[model samples]
Target: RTTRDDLINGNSASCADVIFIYARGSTETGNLGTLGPSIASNLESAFGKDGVWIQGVGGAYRATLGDNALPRGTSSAAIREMLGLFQQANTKCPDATLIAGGYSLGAALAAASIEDLDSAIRDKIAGTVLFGYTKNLQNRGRIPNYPADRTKVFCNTGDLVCTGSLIVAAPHLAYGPDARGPAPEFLIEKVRAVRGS
Candidate 1:
């Protein structure tokens, strides 16, 4: 069994325009499918073949911090690792953009990464796209200064994940806007804006 920390250590690809996908639940295997061929293919079309994808699998809290932070789970170390990957990507593709995309628990990690990044690398990040986010952090008292303008969140109105819950507050956990589904365009714009193109 590959521990969450193992995934971070094993990940070695460096490139511009990278996407960090976080996972939910206690196991890392549950979240690997988020990058199915369909999604990867679309990302390729949007960002070109040079674009990169860093899939941060399950064990969001355990792998990130060696323990969970939130009532659910979170890890400062994991977020830092994700940011480290972003920094490496920046070195490889200085002109490229870095985007963080997550689903469910991953969404929370993405949001937290923005709030707690090193000032220098934080500026390098173009934006974040979240799926399965339901509520705002302020409403839940998870974070105080979440970025509602800078990030992009996709909520499925009828999807159980986005309806009638504090999970809707998850996007607000970061500092961005709530982008309801069909996120391909938003994802593209985020990378382009970061690349300054």
Candidate 2:
């Protein structure tokens, strides 16, 4: 029922050390679904009020059940929407740490979007987080361009969505609590590396 269009609104002149581009999950309604906003909020709070910028991938993305019927369940248009965030941040926030995130099917979109980046933009991305990732088993838990330290993956041990061939479960809906810790710091550390405390 709630979503933020910060990512869709383009950019403000007030630059930030960290720019977060997040894609919401399938059937998530708003462009930025619940889990992605939770983690983005955490990162913003940890980085200070204005130190971080938030953007949610938005478009004609009909986040439906069928949209996630497959493992690589991300549309080319969604990937382009996600990529615009990267291009904008890289062009505008030249010195900032680029952070990416996603939930469920959005995770697959995030992975594909990041993988499509050239080294110039790829190296600027300091961190990424994925929750209930559809590509978990397929990618072997590794996000291509991102190393283990730079990536944070939250998959409930029993999340049928991750391990259960698209079967939704209760655990998949409980990432709100986990979004509070670990993830924020995981990204802040990367932000600090490029941003200096």
Candidate 3:
């Protein structure tokens, strides 16, 4: 029905215990894409309708083979907007912590923005998740300054995109199912750690 893709322009008034913001994959519909919705929905069951506040990227990026090859160039707009979304989330709901994630190109978008986030805001990131993360390969399977334990990497065993080679094997296209249970479990643990995470 109604969408949560752009929170700042719509549901910014919702102040929840957890802020769940996601970026969609290239060519995917809406901002949450195929993966974030499952996790965000499950999070709401635990925190209630208002327990979580969700936002997709502020705008869509033109994702293409060339863009995939040059993720920074292709997803620049999503990256910038993601940065703003996180900052805006914190401003509107200062007491809540956040969980940021995305799939495929959106995952790279997620990683770069998280790495580039302002330190005060970055510290408020309780957890982060990426599916078929292109940046994970670029960054040697690590999610920049974020603690390995707090971040979830949902790269399928045979997914080439997660490899430094950056090939998009068929496995890379189905990371949405992997987000079903693990993502909720991962982020929930991190968020509940609370005043400490």
Candidate 4:
């Protein structure tokens, strides 16, 4: 239910300590119901809701109508959408910490967006957390290099998406439980480090 407009207009006057831009997998919608909420909840508990601005990327589904296709995370649309949010947050909350996270195709988008950002903007980002990232892209060197100390990529052992293996459904679906548990903790540490608290 978190729309792009809501995020863009929601906190114009308030400055958040961290702005989390999270994207869900393809064919998924509504705030990245799994890992996104868990991470936000964890951040809220630590920094309070006012300290964090959590926004989920939309436009993950393709239309059934003739030639009504949608862009995947690797496409320009996905990257643009995420970059816009980052830019807006930066403008509104100049000192706020910025972080990005995504799952599956969404993870690819987050990575691409981060890489596309200007170095100054990129340096301001606290960290990035990626789960179920595409190994195909990673293998092709399309994922790009991120700050080694600020990025955390998590992949399940047999996940086809992450490993480019034959098995697909199980490994992709399996990341929720595994990622949900550790992602928040990883982000918390990043926030603290960035804030120097």
- Best TM-score goes to which candidate? 2
Note the Cα lDDT for every prediction shown.
Answer: 0.48, 0.76, 0.74, 0.68
* Candidate scoring better on TM-score of 1 and 4: 4
Query: For residue 46, what is the lDDT in candidate 1?
Result: 68
Error of 1 at 168 (Å): 13
Please provide, for model 4 over 1-197, each residue's C-alpha lDDT reduced to its tens digit, 9 standing for 90 to 100. 33323356566676777778887765554656466776777777878867777778764322112111223336676678778877887777788887788877677778778878877778787878888777444444244656677877788767767665324567677666655577877887888886821
**Using Cα atoms with residue i matched to residue i, what is each candidate's TM-score against the true structure?**
0.60, 0.89, 0.88, 0.83
- Per-residue lDDT tens digits for candidate 2, residues 58-77, read 76556666867643577777
> Model 1 — TM-score against the truth?
0.60
- Pairs with steric clashes in candidate 4: none
| lDDT of predicted model 2 | 0.76
Q: How does candidate 3 fare on TM-score?
A: 0.88
Candidate 3 C-alpha lDDT tens digits along 1-197: 11475357535455666777887776677666677678777888877776677777745454444566764524576577789888887777787888888788878887888888888888888988888887666787666777787788888878887776567688888865677888888888888887321
- lDDT by residue (tens digit), candidate 1, 8-92: 4433444435553444322334443332233445665766654555444443244332233354345665566555655555554
lDDT, residue 124, candidate 1: 60
**Candidate 4 deviant stretches above 4 angstroms:** 1-6, 59-73, 136-143, 165-167
User: Which prediction has more favorable TM-score, 1 or 2?
Assistant: 2
Predictions: Cα RMSD each: 6.8, 2.2, 2.5, 3.9
Q: Which pairs clash inside model 3?
A: none
